[PDB]
Write a protein that binds this DNA or RNA. Structure first.
Ligand SMILES: Nc1nc2c(ncn2[C@H]2C[C@H](O)[C@@H](COP(=O)(O)OP(=O)(O)OP(=O)(O)O)O2)c(=O)[nH]1
Ligand SMILES: Nc1nc2c(ncn2[C@H]2C[C@H](O)[C@@H](COP(=O)(O)OP(=O)(O)OP(=O)(O)O)O2)c(=O)[nH]1
Ligand SMILES: Nc1ncnc2c1ncn2[C@@H]1O[C@H](COP(=O)(O)OP(=O)(O)OP(=O)(O)O)[C@@H](O)[C@H]1O
Ligand SMILES: Nc1ncnc2c1ncn2[C@@H]1O[C@H](COP(=O)(O)OP(=O)(O)OP(=O)(O)O)[C@@H](O)[C@H]1O
Ligand SMILES: [Mg+2]
Ligand SMILES: [Mg+2]
Ligand SMILES: [Zn+2]
Ligand SMILES: [Zn+2]
Lengths: 343, 355
DNA sequence: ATCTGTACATGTACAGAT
DNA sequence: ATCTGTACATGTACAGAT
DNA sequence: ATCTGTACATGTACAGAT
DNA sequence: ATCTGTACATGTACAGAT
C-alpha cells in the first residue's frame, strides 16, 4: 500500500543520469562565469542543497537547488526587529553602509541571464523573477521540464547569531559533539526579503543536508552494515501528500515542502530511537507524522528548527483559514485510506 | 562483584589536583621542545604536535605520571617498501632530510639520533624544572623525559613521519568497525594521514636501522573518545557505558602483575588495548556494556584475553596479518605463565587489586 | 604601506569535585 | 545535582617582516 | 588558483533465493 | 511476497600536480 506509493515515487536511474548531466553542464558554465570574468562574485563556490542532493526528491528528478556561496569577513549583523531569521548586513561589493540584498541579487541575476543567452546546446531560459524571493530560477528542457534554483549566499565564519542558541535541539538524538561540530560550520545568509529590500535571511541548508544523510541515533543507521529505517520514506510520503494537495487546491499556495521538512525534523527529535522508525512500522510512523502536522495546524505553531522564536505557521505568514482548510483536506485523506495517492 | 570493581575504579581515578600540577609542567617542557624544533637549521622544522596515549584518551590509571606525545613531520615524495611481508614494517624511499638518506633510503636511526641530540641539548638549557633524558632503550622510538616535578613523570616524545596518501594495503582489512561505528566513520578515518615511527630494534637483522613501523595512535584516540554505536554514548544527554572502565581494570590487572613478575616483561598495555578493540567489535551494542554489568563485561574480556594467550593469536587491530602473540615475539612459556596468573586472580576474587 | 606566522579569544565535551 | 579545570578546534589580531 | 584521480558513500535495477 | 548479491550511476571529500 504505502510501499506501492513509494515504488511510484522512486526516481529512475536513467532519468537521474540524463537530468544531472544537463544540470551540471549549465551550473558549471554559470559558476565559471562568476569566476573568470572578474565579477564582484569572484570566489563564489558551489554547494548543492535540497531534496535531490538529500535523496528525498520524489516522482522525477525535475527540481535542483544550488547555492553559490561567497565569504565576506567583518559582516556586522543587526536583527531586523525581533524576527529571528531576518537581518541587515553591515561592514569589490562596494556598489551594493548596508549591503542591500536587492542590489546584490539583481547584479547576480543580470550576470546569469547574460551567460544563459550564450548557451546554444541546451534549451534553457531564466524564469521571470518572483518578488522577495532569493532564487534565480532556470527552466531547462531536455524534452522533460527541469528547474534549477541558483541561490546566492553570503558565508560567514563567525559563531551563529544568538537567535539560534536554542535551536538545533539534537542533543538527545545526534548528540552534543555532532551539535557542537555543526555549529563550528559557517552560517549562511540568503537574499530573501522580509515585508525590506535590504534584508537577508539565514539558511541552514548545509546543516539540513548533513542531518538527512546522518539521521540515526546509531551510526550504522541505513548503512550497508546497519539496518534500514523508514525516516526518509515518511518524509517522501508526507511531501507527496502535500504536493498532490497543492496541485488540486489553490487555497494551499502558502504551504511548501519546507513546512513538511521542518515538521519531521521535530518528529525525529521527539522519537530519536531508530527502532521507533522500523521499516515494518511504516504506516504507524506516517500516521504519527500526520497527527503531529495536524497538531501544528490546530495550534498554529510550527517553529523553525534552527530559530525557535520564528513561527512558520504564524498568523502573519499563513492565514488561519488556509490552515483550517489544509487540516480538513489532510483529515479526510487520513480517514479514507489516502485516495489522493491513487491519482 | 558490581561493588568490588566500583571501589577499584575509585582507587584508579586521577585527582584533578595531580592532573593540573603534572600537565602544567608537561606542557611547558613539550612546548619548549616543539619551539626548538622550528628554528634555524633544524631538519625537523615544520614538525607538529599530536597528543596520544592513555592520558589524552582518559584511560590513564592511578596517577598522571606518563604522557605520550607525537612530533610528526609531513613528507611528500614517499614510496613504501614492505619489510618481508610483515605488514607492519617498512622501508621509506624518496631537502632537509638529505643527511639522513642512504642513497634513496631514509634511515630511521640516523633521523632519530639527530632528533634525540637536539632534544638532549634543549633539556640541558631548562632551569625551571628538574628534567633529564632517559638512556635510550632498544626497540623504542621515543625520546623519554624523566621529570621530577616533585613526583616522577615520564614523557615519551615520539618522532613520526606523516604521509597523507592512502593507507598501505596491509591495512585494507583492518579497522573492522563497520558493524559498530559504521562505514562513514571508517571511510573518514582512512582519509586521515597514516604515521611511521622508528622500529629501532637491536636484533642484528638486515635493514635494522632503516625500518619504520606503522602507528595508528591518532585513530585509536578518536575511537576511544567516540566508542559507542549510539552517538550519545557517554554524553550528557545519553547513557553511560562501561567500555572505558573495563579497559582501566584490565590495564590495572596487567600493571600490577608486571610490577611483581619479570616473567611478564614481553607484555605491555597495547596488548590489552588491542584485545578490547576486538571485544568492542564482537559486542558492538551499547547495551552489551551497561554499567550494571561491569562484572560480567570485565569477565568476558578476561576470557577473550585468556583465549588469545592459549591459542597464541592476537591480531593487530589495524594490520590483521601482524600477530602480536606470535612465538617470534613472546615465548609460549611467557603466555602460559600470564594465563595461570590471570586465571588465578579471576577465581580468587582479584587479590592483586588490593595491593 | 601591506603581509603573515604565532598565539590569543571563544566555546564546550569530558570527567573530577563538591 | 551543579560547578569547574584541561584539552582541543576554529576564528581572528598584530608585531615584526616585507 | 584550478583540475583530475581515487575511494566509497548515497542511490536504482534486477535475478536468484528465501 | 520479501531478501540478498551483483551491477550500474551520481555525488562528494581531498591528495597531489600543475
Ligand atoms: N538553499 C536554499 N534555497 C533557498 C532558501 N530559501 C529559499 N530557497 C530557494 C528554494 C525555494 O523554493 C525558493 C523560493 O524561496 P521561498 O519560497 O522562501 O520564497 P518566495 O519569495 O518564492 O515565496 P514564498 O515565501 O514561498 O511565498 O528559493 C535557503 O535558505 N536555502
Ligand atoms: N605514537 C606512538 N608511540 C609509540 C608507538 N610504539 C611505541 N610508542 C612509544 C610510546 C610508548 O610509551 C613507548 C613504548 O616503546 P615500545 O612500544 O617500542 O616498547 P617495546 O616494544 O620495546 O617493549 P614493550 O612491548 O612495551 O615491553 O614507545 C607507536 O606505534 N605510536
Ligand atoms: N521557507 C524556507 N525557509 C528556509 N529555508 C528554506 C525555505 N524554503 C526552502 N529552504 C531551503 O532551501 C532548500 C530548497 O528548497 P526547495 O523548495 O527546493 O525544497 P526541497 O528541500 O529541495 O524539496 P522539494 O524540491 O522536493 O520540494 C530547502 O531544502 C531548504 O534548505
Ligand atoms: N607495540 C605497539 N604497537 C603499536 N602501537 C603501540 C605499541 N605500543 C604503544 N603503541 C602506541 O603508542 C601509544 C602510547 O604507548 P603507551 O605504552 O604509553 O600506552 P598507553 O595506551 O598510553 O597506556 P599506558 O601509558 O597507560 O600504559 C599507545 O596508546 C599506542 O597507540
Ligand atoms: Mg528542491
Ligand atoms: Mg602511555
Ligand atoms: Zn536510517
Ligand atoms: Zn560510552
Amino acid at each position: 500500500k504505502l510501499k506501492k506509493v513509494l515504488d511510484k515515487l522512486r526516481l529512475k536511474r536513467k532519468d537521474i543520469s540524463e537530468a544531472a548531466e544537463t544540470v551540471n553542464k549549465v551550473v558549471e558554465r554559470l559558476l565559471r562565469r562568476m569566476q573568470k570574468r572578474e565579477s564582484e562574485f569572484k570566489g563564489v563556490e558551489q554547494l548543492n542543497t535540497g531534496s535531490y542532493y538529500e535523496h528525498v526528491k520524489i516522482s522525477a528528478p525535475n527540481e535542483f537547488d544550488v547555492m553559490f556561496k561567497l565569504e565576506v569577513p567583518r559582516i556586522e549583523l543587526q536583527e531586523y526587529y525581533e524576527t529571528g531569521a531576518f537581518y541587515l548586513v553591515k561592514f569589490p561589493l562596494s556598489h551594493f553602509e548596508v549591503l542591500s540584498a536587492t542590489k546584490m541579487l539583481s547584479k547576480f541575476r543580470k550576470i546569469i541571464k547574460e551567460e544563459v543567452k550564450e548557451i546554444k546546446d541546451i534549451d534553457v531560459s531564466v524564469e521571470k523573477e518572483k518578488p522577495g524571493s532569493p532564487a534565480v530560477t532556470l527552466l531547462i528542457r531536455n524534452p522533460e521540464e527541469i528547474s534549477v534554483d541558483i541561490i546566492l549566499a553570503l558565508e560567514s565564519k563567525g559563531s551563529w547569531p544568538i537567535s539560534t542558541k536554542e535551536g538545533l535541539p539534537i542533543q538527545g538524538w545526534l548528540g552534543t559533539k555532532v551539535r557542537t561540530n555543526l555549529r563550528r560550520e559557517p552560517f549562511y545568509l540568503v537574499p530573501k526579503n522580509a515585508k525590506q529590500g535590504e534584508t537577508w535571511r539565514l539558511s541552514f541548508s548545509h546543516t539540513e543536508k548533513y542531518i538527512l544523510n546522518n539521521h540515526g541515533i546509531e551510526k550504522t543507521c541505513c548503512e550497508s552494515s546497519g539496518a534500514k529505517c523508514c525516516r526518509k520514506e515518511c518524509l517522501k510520503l508526507m511531501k507527496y501528500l502535500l504536493e498532490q494537495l497543492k496541485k488540486e487546491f489553490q487555497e494551499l499556495d502558502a504551504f511548501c515542502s519546507y513546512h513538511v521538512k521542518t515538521a519531521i525534523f521535530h518528529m525525529w527529535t521527539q522519537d530519536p530511537q531508530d527502532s521507533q522508525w522500523d521499516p515494518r512500522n511504516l504506516s504507524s510512523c506516517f500516521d504519527k507524522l500526520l497527527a503531529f502536522f495536524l497538531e501544528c495546524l490546530r495550534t498554529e505553531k510550527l517553529d523553525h528548527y534552527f530559530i525557535p522564536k520564528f513561527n512558520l505557521f504564524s498568523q502573519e505568514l499563513i492565514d488561519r483559514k488556509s490552515k483550517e482548510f489544509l487540516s480538513k483536506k489532510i483529515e479526510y485523506e487520513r480517514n479514507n485510506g489516502f485516495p489522493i495517492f491513487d491519482k
